[PDB]
């Protein structure tokens, strides 16, 4: 039955006429998975004039289950039993992520109701993360929860969490368990994320004509349907890859969009939902903008675009959501507005020549339950701001100089650190990360090869390598909050020098883990001939300051930094 939406310059919501409630299997090709538990509505602030806003839902394994090929029957267990895809207990306890996005320029109220017979609870039972930004919350007479969201040029991106819905993740140090063990995370069984986004900057909506734009028609995407125009435009509606590379129809997750070199802009309207992935070929500056969604939900784990999209890992040919393999040099990617859902592998890589950078803002990543779902690369001189990324691998990969990352909210599953700087020797300077909110983690294991930490550097990816004393990493990391019983601040295997490395204003309000798993302990081992020039200040845990008197492994900071570095680093 019919939704009551609103779209003006004040705020904009949307719907889909092919929503499907489904918690177990893939949705139909032309359908969109819709929240089984929540409705969301938006009104101008204080007016009690509520309009429907679609609530999407994403589930572990996308309903496909453990399958080797995208044409396999769902939940048929064709993936080899030895492959760990990053999912274990999550389906049996009902874990999923729902979200709703709208556009706004004026203060609004957001109303949430349950649709499955649940009681949401009183307003005092609600927590909104990141906790750095608080909200006025009230209860309506029908039991609904109402949140006042003020206008903000940067928008707001937040998780609404109800006490009686929370699941407690327990681990024995090797696997999640249903009782006993140690607490490694507390988060919604049924997550609900709100994206209150600003309207796009005028320069990030392309000027489209019939001559310069291929306008797509909702329905199946057959090979070549995307054409060869400057701009590829997806208006509101549902779209899905429907053929394999040979042109056989009725196959999902069996191809991606290899753009003509003419096409430099992909524009996703609000209310567009595209099941696919994008590979650019152009040698000029290129774009991904708009408030639509690109979803990898039909792709299997590690889907190999060089081998029929099956679940065989290749670092070179496993499918990225945003990809390029033919860079010309002197290029910038402009990514402003999009949401990606359910990536099968690493989310973004641009290859071919080193002269690349990105400007990324108002950019979201959800439903990333699989291993290897890292955040986008942070190429030289990139500027990233106002992002919300769910990840089960490296969130922020600092491999290049000059980059800035600001106002990033990260929801971690159980693999690799928040910030990653390791794998090889690197020379980096001029990097700033500020206002970083880590709102959840749920590490099963305490690890250093894939560091379970906020600031991490993995050891050498290959044997017969030596740390390089002529190289150094320098950066500033400021205004960090980790919420919940948290992992360690630092796990760095030194592969080169650390110099003028500033870490300031870092808070762990709920404490570090202090369990027998050991995840809370920071670890920086000896590395002969290298310096560890860390300047740490204003580090608090549970509201108490970490100082030179309580930093140690068996005290508050749990900072097991090797004694060989004494004097090179300081906490103040």
């Amino acid at each position: 039955t019919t939704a009551n939406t609103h779209c003006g310059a004040d705020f904009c919501t949307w719907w889909h006429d092919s929503g499907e409630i489904n918690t177990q299997t893939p949705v139909q090709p032309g359908n969109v998975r819709q929240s089984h538990k929540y409705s969301v509505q938006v009104s101008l602030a204080g007016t009690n004039n509520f309009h429907d806003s679609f609530v999407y839902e994403s589930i572990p394994r996308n309903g496909n289950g453990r399958i080797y090929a995208p044409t396999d029957p769902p939940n048929s267990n064709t993936l080899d039993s030895s492959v760990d895809d990053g999912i274990s207990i999550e389906p049996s306890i009902g874990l999923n992520m729902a979200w709703s996005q709208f556009e706004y320029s004026h203060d609004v109220d957001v109303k949430i109701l349950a649709t499955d017979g649940s009681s949401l609870g009183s307003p005092s039972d609600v927590v909104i993360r990141p906790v750095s930004i608080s909200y006025a919350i009230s209860q309506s007479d029908d039991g609904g929860i109402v949140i006042r969201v003020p206008a903000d040029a940067n928008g707001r991106k937040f998780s609404v969490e109800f006490k009686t819905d929370l699941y407690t993740f327990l681990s024995d140090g090797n696997e999640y368990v249903t009782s006993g063990g140690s607490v490694v995370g507390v988060e919604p069984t049924n997550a609900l994320v709100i994206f209150a986004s600003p309207f796009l900057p005028s320069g990030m909506i392309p000027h489209m004509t019939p001559d310069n734009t291929q306008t797509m028609t909702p329905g199946p995407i057959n090979n070549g349907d995307w054409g060869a125009k400057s701009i590829l435009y997806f208006p509101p509606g549902v779209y899905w890859m429907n053929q394999d590379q040979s042109g056989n129809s009725g196959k999902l997750g069996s191809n991606h969009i290899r753009l003509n070199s003419n096409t430099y802009w992909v524009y996703l309207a609000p209310g567009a939902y595209v099941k696919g992935a994008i590979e650019y070929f152009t040698k000029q500056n290129f774009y991904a903008t708009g408030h639509g969604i690109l979803s990898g939900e039909n792709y299997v784990y590690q889907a190999n675009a060089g081998d029929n999209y099956i679940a065989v890992k290749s670092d070179s040919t496993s499918l990225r959501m945003w990809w390029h393999n033919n860079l010309g040099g002197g290029q910038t990617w402009y990514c402003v507005g999009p949401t990606i859902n359910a990536p099968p592998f690493n989310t973004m890589d641009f290859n071919g020549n080193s002269g690349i950078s990105s400007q990324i803002s108002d950019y979201k990543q959800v439903g990333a339950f699989f291993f290897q779902t890292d955040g986008p690369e942070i190429y030289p001189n990139s500027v990233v701001h106002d992002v919300f990324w769910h990840v089960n691998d490296d969130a922020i990969k600092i491999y290049y100089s000059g980059a800035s990352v600001s106002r990033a909210t990260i929801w971690k599953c159980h693999n690799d650190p928040i910030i990653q700087m390791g794998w090889t020797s690197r020379d980096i300077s001029g990097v700033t990360i500020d206002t970083l909110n880590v709102i959840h983690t749920r590490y099963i294991k305490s690890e250093t090869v894939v560091p379970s930490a906020i600031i991490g550097a993995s050891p050498f990816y290959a044997s017969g390598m030596s740390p390089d004393s002529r190289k150094s990493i320098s950066m500033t990391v400021s205004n960090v909050v980790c919420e919940g019983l948290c992992p360690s601040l630092f796990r760095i295997t030194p592969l080169q020098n650390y110099k003028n490395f500033v870490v300031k204003n870092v808070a762990f309000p709920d404490g570090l883990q202090t369990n027998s798993i050991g995840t809370g302990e920071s670890i920086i081992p000896a590395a002969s001939g290298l310096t560890m020039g860390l300047a740490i200040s204003a580090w608090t845990i549970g509201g108490q300051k970490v100082t030179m008197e309580n930093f140690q492994a068996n005290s508050l900071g749990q900072f097991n930094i090797d004694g060989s570095y004494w004097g090179e680093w300081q906490i103040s």
Side-chain angles (χ1 to χ4, degrees), residues 50-70:
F50 284 100
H51 291 61
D52 298 306
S53 181
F54 195 87
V55 190
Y56 305 92
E57 183 177 291
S58 192
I59 68 181
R61 301 175 177 143
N62 311 127
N64 287 137
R66 293 178 55 82
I67 58 166
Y68 183 73

Side-chain angles (χ1 to χ4, degrees), residues 282-327:
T282 178
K283 307 286 189 180
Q284 63 189 104
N285 282 0
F286 56 107
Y287 301 72
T289 70
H291 280 140
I293 291 151
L294 185 67
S295 178
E297 73 199 77
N298 295 144
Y299 302 110
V300 304
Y301 177 54
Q302 307 171 314
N304 192 329
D307 194 5
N308 301 299
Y309 299 77
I310 67 184
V312 171
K313 181 184 171 164
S314 171
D315 284 318
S316 68
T317 65
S318 280
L319 181 61
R320 279 62 173 186
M321 297 303 291
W322 312 104
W323 216 3
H324 206 289
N325 288 286
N326 287 278
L327 288 175

Side-chain angles (χ1 to χ4, degrees), residues 365 372-376 389 391-397 399 412 415-421 423 450-451 458:
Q365 169 170 330
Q372 302 183 269
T373 48
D374 50 12
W389 301 336
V391 303
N392 202 10
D393 216 309
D394 300 325
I396 300 162
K397 292 181 274 186
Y399 295 166
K412 167 72 74 172
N415 181 246
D416 257 330
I418 308 302
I419 293 157
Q420 170 72 256
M421 320 172 277
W423 297 121
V450 284
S458 291

